[PDB]
């Protein structure tokens, strides 16, 4: 029932998921002047060289590229994290217009889109158990701006034709998520939540400072997707972002001086 319309969008979610008004909700606005460098942060390790992608799925919210997480293959370690976090999927949030689409904002600036690489803490054995823990997940967030094309994104753009409507999937093997990273791994980190229902407060957020650039044509292909299922009235999959939530008693830490 929840979605991103006037009748079922983020302002309505709290009626089915009261944690929507919780103490560690995401996303947030990152006030870069209030964020503090934290010398206790260890180097961030993004280790994706043995990633094994499997499939791409339109789940009615976004599209997810899913990975084989049955072994340590593609993992996130270091930074604010304790232990090893395994990549399970990535997806994006985007706008109807280039001036909006990201979930996190930076000094109130909205980006055209935001990539979420989702990882779970291997100490909990599987994703389902990890989402019952306050340090169960780590999401690596990457902003997208419109400018030059991102070559590493093109294979995603070109399969979207095949998963236009909710519940469609396609084989998506041998995709290398390293092609979606910016040059610098400088980040902000804070404790938060899933940004969609069930909005569970399990996430260590790691949001990169440097955006990647994608072309107008690339983001336009995202906006041709549908929220609805085949045969249903066409609802373009656009503006699938939750706005910034109250920071409450949290501190955002920076990895850079
Ligand atoms: N935006 S985010 O990175 O913060 C984020 C990351 C992961 C999930 C997620 O795994 N949600 C699934 C889940 C299954 C079991 C327990 C809890 C959560 C779920 C539940 N119903 N559908 N899904 C799939 C889901 O919503 N896919 C993520 C695409 C966001 S537009 C949601 C948001
Ligand atoms: Zn997300």
From Swiss-Prot:
UniProt keyword annotation of Cell membrane present: yes
Any one Gene Ontology molecular-function term assigned to this protein's record: zinc ion binding
Result for mutant: residue 64 to L: Reduced activity
UniProt KW keywords: Acetylation, Cell membrane, Cytoplasm, Disease variant, Lyase, Membrane, Metal-binding, Osteopetrosis, Phosphoprotein, Zinc
GO cellular component, one term: extracellular exosome
The organism's place on the tree of life at top rank: Eukaryota
Result when mutating residue 114 to Q: Strongly reduced activity and sulfonamide affinity
Record: disease: Osteopetrosis, autosomal recessive 3: A rare genetic disease characterized by abnormally dense bone, due to defective resorption of immature bone. Osteopetrosis occurs in two forms: a severe autosomal recessive form occurring in utero, infancy, or childhood, and a benign autosomal dominant form occurring in adolescence or adulthood. Recessive osteopetrosis commonly manifests in early infancy with macrocephaly, feeding difficulties, evolving blindness and deafness, bone marrow failure, severe anemia, and hepatosplenomegaly.
Record's protein name: Carbonic anhydrase 2
Source organism of the structure: Homo sapiens (Human)
Gene: CA2
